Design a protein around this ligand. Structure first.
Ligand SMILES: *[C@@H]1O[C@H](CO[C@H]2O[C@@H](C)[C@@H](O)[C@@H](O)[C@@H]2O)[C@@H](O[C@@H]2O[C@H](CO)[C@@H](O)[C@H](O)[C@H]2NC(C)=O)[C@H](O)[C@H]1NC(C)=O
Ligand SMILES: *[C@@H]1O[C@H](CO)[C@@H](O[C@@H]2O[C@H](CO)[C@@H](O)[C@H](O)[C@H]2NC(C)=O)[C@H](O)[C@H]1NC(C)=O
Length: 570
């Protein structure tokens, strides 16, 4: 069969097969058909009579110039239609006749010059329309949109809109039941007429790479006046040379909008102000700063009423002091600069993600660090040296804890989680941890996920350090340089479904070491130099054999490389 078969009687990827005609040899039950990159040229009446069940139809880049009325006539169960990259020069009035289910239409780069003559007014079930990268130069919304009641996403990015006039959204105004996300990214925009957005509300507005000047952006923002939006996103990724100044007053126009959530993604711009720059955002529930440089200023510590604060991929010069009474979720991630955590006062913080910053933590972890007792989630992975001093005092409600790839100090010779009786997920992988003290994990009676890959053990021996972890479901001991296991090590792990022991130096295991893993569903034992010289291997070869469905990858013996599951000992 020329057509690649992905899922029988369901999916087919007839990609680039020089099809001049729709393949008739295919089944009738096919729900997903990809005909992308085939010279179809013209889609005639009932082009798809042979596909009753079709739900997804990809006609990407099939040099289609004409689509006749009823080309998709019988496609009553089609939901997504991809036309992307077809040089359409003739669309009949009824080219989309029969598409009584269509929820998504992608018509990127279809030489579309305007929405006015686009014959889609009758597709009531349409939820998504993507017309990015066409020649559309008008923001005027066609009168048929009034029939497009379920439309939730309009993609107008990469077109030719330079001006938005007061008269452009009259039809949208008469639709006070619509929930529309609009993206106008990459339109050459210079003017938005004041008042055009009064009494308008959108779920989301994206404006990225739209303005040639931080004086033209301002003019366009003043024409946004009256707009009530759930999520405003302002992006600019085109800065080349030095870091560019983001004028402190460039945002004072945002006071005359209603925004619930705000993101500013201004690549290599730098802020020399905070308080007045972000004044018009004081009451936003979700604030977001991405890719910006914040050196001169270092204190968001005001009374901003933000509940969610996201600071990602920025340059800081120093870890900023934050003091916010209403912040519940903080995301401080993938930033560079000032490699040192500094105490914050964030009462009512429930979620704290501080991963991937290279930060050092000289004392950790307690309430006096964070200003909260409500912490449920704490992620300190991919940072520098974390020195433990406090056993999570004021933070006993923790349910998720992640330290992976951070250098942890004063943890292994202690019982630092003794108070964490609600902890469900703990990851200490690659934390320079060297196990000795059998008490390392005491107190973790409700723990289910324990990741400790890439560490090591005193004498490469795994002692009975999982005794009180009766709720354990997932355990990763991969890459731990293990040479010997304790025979009673997994005795309590009655609920363990996943055991990963791959990439160790295990030659053998104690007989009956899995006897009590009655819940075990998946096991990794590969990349270990197993020794298949009977009776030594008998227990393991026997166990892997009858439990073969459970084994992930392939355990093999040193030398022969024969699968350990394949060995039969006398
Ligand atoms: C941050 O919010 C406060 C209070 O929140 C009120 O905002 C009102 C405009 C309205 O949505 C109301 O329902 C909501 O409770 C704002 O205080 C308002 O300030 C204006 C002048 O700026 C006064 O005229 C209002 O009386 C006052 N609100 C009320 C009704 O007490 C505040 O302006 C706002 N600040 C920023 C930076 O946006
Ligand atoms: C071990 O896991 C069990 C089972 O999932 C947990 O039992 C739950 O306890 C909480 C706290 O009271 C209840 O809200 C749940 O309804 C219980 N689960 C059910 C449906 O049985 C237990 O908390 C965990 N830790 C232990 C036993 O200390």
């Amino acid at each position: 069969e020329p057509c690649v078969e992905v899922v029988p009687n369901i999916t087919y990827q007839c990609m680039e097969l020089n099809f001049y005609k729709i393949p008739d040899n295919l089944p009738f039950s096919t729900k997903n058909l990809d005909l992308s990159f085939n010279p179809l040229r013209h889609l005639g009446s009932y082009s798809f009579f042979s596909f009753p069940e079709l739900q997804v139809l990809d006609l990407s880049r099939c040099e289609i110039q004409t689509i006749e009325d009823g080309a998709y006539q019988s496609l009553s169960h089609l939901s997504t239609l991809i036309l992307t990259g077809n040089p359409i020069q003739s669309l009949a009035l009824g080219a989309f006749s029969g598409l009584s289910s269509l929820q998504k239409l992608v018509a990127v780069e279809t030489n579309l010059a305007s929405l006015e003559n686009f014959p889609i007014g009758h597709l009531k079930t349409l939820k998504e329309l993507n017309v990015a990268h066409n020649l559309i130069q008008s923001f005027k919304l066609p009168e048929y949109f009034s029939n497009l009641t379920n439309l939730e996403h309009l993609d107008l990015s990469s077109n030719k809109i330079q001006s938005i006039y007061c008269t452009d959204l009259r039809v949208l105004h008469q639709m006070p039941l619509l929930n529309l996300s609009l993206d106008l990214s990459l339109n050459p925009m210079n003017f938005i007429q004041p008042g055009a957005f009064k009494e308008i509300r959108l779920h989301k507005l994206t404006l990225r790479n739209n303005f040639d000047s931080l004086n033209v952006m301002k003019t366009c923002i003043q024409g946004l006046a009256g707009l009530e939006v759930h999520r405003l996103v302002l992006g600019e990724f085109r800065n080349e040379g030095n870091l560019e100044k983001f004028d402190k007053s460039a945002l004072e126009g945002l006071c005359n909008l209603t925004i619930e959530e705000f993101r500013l993604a201004y690549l290599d711009y730098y802020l020399d102000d905070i308080i007045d720059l972000f004044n018009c955002l004081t009451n936003v529930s979700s604030f977001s700063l991405v890719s910006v440089t914040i050196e001169r200023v270092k204190d968001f510590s005001y009374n901003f009423g933000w509940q969610h604060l996201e600071l990602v991929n920025c340059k800081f010069g120093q870890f900023p002091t934050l003091k916010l009474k209403s912040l519940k979720r903080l995301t401080f991630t993938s930033n560079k600069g000032g490699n040192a955590f500094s105490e914050v006062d964030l009462p009512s913080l429930e979620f704290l993600d501080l991963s991937r910053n290279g930060l050092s933590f000289k004392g950790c972890c307690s309430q006096s660090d964070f200003g909260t007792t409500s912490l449920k989630y704490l992620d300190l992975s991919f940072n520098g040296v974390i020195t433990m001093s406090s056993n999570f005092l004021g933070l006993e409600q923790l349910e998720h804890l992640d330290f992976q790839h951070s250098n942890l100090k004063q943890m292994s010779e202690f019982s630092v989680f003794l108070s964490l009786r609600n902890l469900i997920y703990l990851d200490i992988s690659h934390t320079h941890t060297r196990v000795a003290f059998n008490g390392i994990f005491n107190g973790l009676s409700s723990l289910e996920v324990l990741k400790m890959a890439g560490n090591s053990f005193q004498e490469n021996f795994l002692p009975d350090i999982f005794t009180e972890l009766r709720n354990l479901t997932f355990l990763d001991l991969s890459q731990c340089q293990l040479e010997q296991l304790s025979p009673t090590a997994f005795n309590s792990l009655s609920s363990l479904q996943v055991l990963n022991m791959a990439s160790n130096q295990l030659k053998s295991v104690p007989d009956g070491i899995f006897d009590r893993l009655t819940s075990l569903q998946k096991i990794w034992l590969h990349t270990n130099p197993w020794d298949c010289s009977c009776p030594r291997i008998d227990y393991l070869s026997r166990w892997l054999n009858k439990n073969s469905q459970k084994e992930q990858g392939s355990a093999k013996c040193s030398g022969s490389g024969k699968p350990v599951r394949s060995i039969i000992c006398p």
